[PDB]
From a paper:
One of these resistance mechanisms entails the enzymatic cleavage of the macrolides’ macrolactone ring by erythromycin esterases (Eres). EreC is an extremely close homologue of EreA, displaying more than 90% sequence identity. Crystal form I, determined to a resolution of 2.0 Å, has one molecule per asymmetric unit, and crystal form II was resolved to 2.4 Å and has two molecules of EreC per asymmetric unit. Both crystal forms show that the protein can be divided into two parts, a major and a minor lobe. The major lobe makes up the greater portion of the protein and is composed of 8 β-strands (β1–6, β9, and β12) forming a continuous sheet, surrounded by α-helices and loops.
We determined the three-dimensional structure of EreC H289N in two different crystal forms. Most of the EreC structure is effectively identical in the two crystal forms, as is reflected in pairwise RMSD values of 0.25–0.41 Å between the three crystallographically independent EreC molecules. However, there is a notable difference in a loop between residues 295 and 303. In crystal form II, the loop is directed away from the rest of the enzyme, and we have called this the open configuration (EreCOpen). Not unexpectantly, electron density corresponding to erythromycin could not be explicitly identified in either of the two structures. We selected a water molecule present in the close vicinity of catalytic residues (H50, E78, and H289) that is conserved in both the open and closed conformations of the enzyme, strongly suggesting it is the second substrate in the hydrolysis reaction. By comparing EreCOpen and EreCClosed, in conjunction with the docking results, we were able to identify a loop rich in glycine and proline, which is capable of closing over the active site.
Author numbering: 10 to 417
The structure:
């Protein structure tokens, strides 16, 4: 049998009992990276649970950064939203549609939580621009290299003209405008980025020596972002083209793995809460039917020799779940979020053990530290099949998954 604990206050950030969460201190001990999952995007109970566990990890375990599925320039605008107590400091002016929908309630809660608690937290973007629009990365790169390697400002500029066509506000719309370029131009862009990355890597010893050592670090981060953005656009154009080779979806997660890895050693004092989907936080291959859909970011991260990565998945016992529907014409993001039947709970489901251990009407929290018949877990409206004792450290379960209010 397992270690479980009913947590009644879990869905109430304001009125929280931290003793309910003492179950988590064994695995939060000597961890520097902990992922707060979500069985599906856009779920209100999952934002509530995320805020409560954020407040727990912060106030009892000194976590000082939050990782988001947004590019690092998106994240720096969110940190402007956070610290600004100025007039009309609304989130709609420091976020984009998809960021707003994925993270809105959490971000509003966090802004008001740090203004009411004096604590300060470091927002970090661990993802590509979640719009897959490379313009910001390209423009900031051009501004850095004009100082540290002006001789290849032309190429950068031409690159941004070559990619100016990629202005979507979602992954799918920029994907569609990427499939609209003829392939000679796609290849021109990809090869030009690889050439840039190699010149910069090779000149590093002298480019570090101009202005500040950190401008080269930022230029390399921007180039990494762009390279993986273009390769995600390609991989996705082939997903809706039937040329999608098994496993390609691992690429974006690998980027995020790298981004987390490279940052945590660089600032060895950072304890980072990660807000990312269950499939990204997972530590084993993501498989819905036995195929290898992706190596998740967390599998890479579990290979960190320091063994200080923990993954806490979030799931629910509800009958419905918000689900993304493609396409949704006219919708700002090229998809819509519709209430759809969750995947059925079966005898090999984590959720069926949750029913048979905690009940159906109080949120639950358990360790995976025990052999178990549970092979499966809800993800979006489908399910993943995996060893759940090695895919996640913990499992938070809530009775139901309702659409978070502010997504539209």
């Amino acid at each position: 049998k397992m270690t479980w604990r009913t947590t009644r206050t879990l869905l109430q950030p304001q009125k929280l009992d931290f003793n309910e969460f003492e179950i988590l201190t064994p695995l939060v001990e000597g961890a520097r990276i902990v992922g707060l999952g979500e069985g599906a995007h856009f779920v209100a109970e999952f934002s509530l649970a995320r805020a409560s566990l954020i407040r727990y990890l912060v106030e009892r375990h000194d976590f000082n950064a939050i990782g988001l599925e947004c590019g690092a320039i998106q994240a720096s605008r969110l940190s402007e939203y956070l610290n600004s107590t100025a007039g009309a400091h609304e989130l709609e002016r420091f976020s984009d549609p998809l960021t707003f929908s994925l993270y809105g309630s959490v971000l509003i809660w966090i802004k008001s939580y740090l203004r009411e608690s004096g604590r300060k937290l470091q927002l970090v973007g661990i993802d590509l621009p979640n719009t897959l629009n490379p313009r910001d990365d390209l423009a900031q790169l051009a501004e850095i290299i004009k100082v540290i390697d002006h001789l290849i400002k032309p190429h950068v500029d031409e690159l941004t003209h070559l990619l100016a066509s990629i202005d979507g506000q979602s992954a799918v719309i920029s994907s569609a405008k990427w499939g609209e370029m003829e392939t000679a131009q796609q290849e021109k862009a990809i090869s030009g980025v690889t050439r840039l990355k190699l010149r910069l890597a090779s000149l590093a010893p002298v480019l570090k020596k101009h202005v500040n050592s950190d401008l080269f670090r930022k230029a390399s981060d921007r180039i990494e972002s762009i390279e993986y953005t273009l390769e995600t656009l390609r991989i996705m154009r082939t997903f809706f083209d039937g040329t999608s080779l098994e496993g390609d979806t691992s690429v974006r997660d690998s980027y995020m793995a790298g981004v987390v890895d490279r940052m945590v050693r660089a600032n060895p004092d950072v304890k980072i809460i990660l807000l990312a989907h269950n499939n990204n936080l997972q530590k084993t291959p993501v498989s819905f039917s036995g195929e290898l859909t992706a190596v998740p970011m967390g599998q890479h991260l579990a290979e960190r020799e320091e063994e200080d990565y923990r993954a806490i998945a979030f799931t629910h016992l509800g009958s419905t779940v918000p689900e993304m529907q493609f396409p949704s014409p006219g919708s700002p993001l090229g998809f819509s979020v519709v209430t759809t039947p969750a995947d059925a709970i079966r005898e090999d489901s984590m959720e069926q053990y949750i029913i048979d251990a905690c009940g159906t009407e109080d949120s639950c929290l358990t360790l995976t530290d025990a052999p178990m018949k549970a092979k499966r877990m809800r993800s979006q409206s489908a399910s993943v099949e995996t060893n759940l004792s090695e895919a996640f450290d913990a499992i938070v379960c809530v009775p139901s998954a309702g659409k978070d209010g502010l997504v539209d």
